[PDB]
Amino acid sequence: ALYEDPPDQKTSPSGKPATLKICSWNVDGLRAWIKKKGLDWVKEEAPDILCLQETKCSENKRPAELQELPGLSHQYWSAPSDKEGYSGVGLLSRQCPLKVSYGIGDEEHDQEGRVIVAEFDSFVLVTAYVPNAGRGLVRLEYRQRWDEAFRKFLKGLASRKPLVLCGDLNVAHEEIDLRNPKGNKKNAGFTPQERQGFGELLQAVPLADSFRHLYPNTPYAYTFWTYMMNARSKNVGWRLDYFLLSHSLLPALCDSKIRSKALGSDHCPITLYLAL
DNA sequence: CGACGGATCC
DNA sequence: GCTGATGCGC
DNA sequence: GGATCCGTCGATCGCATCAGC
Ligand SMILES: [Mg+2]
């Protein structure tokens, strides 16, 4: 069955207007995504903050078009030192953050280019490209060890401000989060191990899944479709991209969107509206 | 990772 | 410099 | 004997490198 995201709710449950719009997008190659007009879509979306995953692009190769975003002028990029053309994340912001950091602790010695932390006035934003378990699960144990390290890193954040975590967390939490749950229970992204790590992330930090909090029983809402077999045209997909929020931020939550129609990648964008 | 073929379930 | 093949990861 | 379960197979993409010219 196809899916149509509901209209943008730009007002908090108590009636407060949204003041902050965050967009997150696994672009599956920054240079290719720009050629497929991804940046034209970002301009129409006009977010205050834009988070990108899988940029696959070093610091010298970023297209000029990107610097020329005047409403997103503060930009922070990280790529892995070893595997250029792999991973890579970015964070673009209207206002300048108070602090930006990279990685989950040892980045200066282990530059993986998967995590950016940006502290703002009233909240901390983490965007993440979570490592894949791999075809045939060959890196699943590494993913479980990474999940645990990431969990610990997020819990032990010095700042007492609430947390927004977004990006490609590379797991469909529950059966409602993908089209073919039973056929995928031993595939990367829906193993019991990755699902349990997601549940432990929510409990340990603690965090709430913004989209599922608002739409707890809505099926067929996905953010990824394999390029192959025309999966996107049949909406055979997985929800892999999330906005996870501190409990204190839930009254500020206006809406959590899935931008199903925006092309340019095998993921589509997600967008958060907060009344801060 | 979806499609597909083959086995098992009542 | 440019194309297309191959390898790799996802 | 329709529905479900489960293991196998080949499918798209972006980017790096390499061969060739
Ligand atoms: Mg990907």
Distance CA A24, CA A220 (A): 20
Distance from C-alpha of A244 to C-alpha of A210, rounded to nearest angstrom: 6
Closest residue by C-alpha to C1' distance, nucleotide D14: A29
Q: Domain range spanning residue A232? A: 1-276
> Apex CA A65: angle with CA A59 and CA A68, to 5°?
95
Annotated binding site of A for Mg(2+): 26, 54, 168, 170, 266-267
CA distance A48 to A33: 20
Place of tokens 């645990």: A148
Distance CA A16, CA A13 (A): 7
Could you tell me the CA-to-CA distances from A230 to A162, A236, A238 in Å, in that order? 40, 9, 14
Burial A13-47 (b: 16+ CB within 10 A, else e): eeeeebebbbbbbbbbbbeebbeeebbebbeebeb
| CA gap A189, A196 in Å, rounded | 11
Nucleotide nearest to A29 (CA to C1'): D14
Q: What is the number of structural domains in chain A?
A: 1
* Spatial distance from the CA of A122 to the C1' of C10 (Å): 36
**Max Cα–Cα distance, chain A, nearest Å:** 49
Question: Mapping DSSP to helix (H, G, I), strand (E, B) and coil, where does residue A75 land?
Answer: strand
Strand D: which bases are under 7 Å from protein Cβ? Answer: 5-8, 10-17
User: Which residues, in sequence order, are CB contacts of A158 under 8 Å at separation 6+?
Assistant: none
Cis status of the peptide bond prior to A206, with omega within 30 of 0: yes
Helix or strand run (H / E) with residue A199:
helix A192-204
Q: Ligand 1 centroid to A75 CA: how many Å?
A: 22
CA distances from A166 to A11, A64, A170, A227, A240 (A): 21, 26, 11, 23, 10
Q: Cα(A209) to centroid of ligand 1, in Å? A: 21
Residues of A marked active site are found at 129, 168, 267
Indicate the pairing of strand A49-53 with strand A74-78. unpaired
CATH for A236: 3.60.10.10
Compute the Cα dihedral for A154, A206, A210, A9 and give only its sign: negative
Q: After which residues is chain A broken (C to N over 2.5 A)?
A: none
Backbone angles phi, psi at A134, to 5 degrees: 90, 150
Give the orientation angle of helix A140-155 with respect to helix A192-204, to 10 degrees: 0
* Sign of the alpha-carbon torsion through A256, A260, A264, A265: positive
Contact between A98 and A120 under an 8 Å Cβ cutoff? The reply is yes
Contact status, residue A31 vs residue A85, Cβ threshold 8 Å: no
Written as one letter, the residue type at A54 is E
How far from A143 is each of A43, A123, A227, A251, CA to CA, in Å? 34, 27, 23, 33
Q: How far is the CA of A132 from the C1' of D8 (A)?
A: 22
Question: What is the CA A186 to C1' D8 distance in angstroms?
Answer: 14
Closest CA to A126 of A95, A87, A97, A94: A97
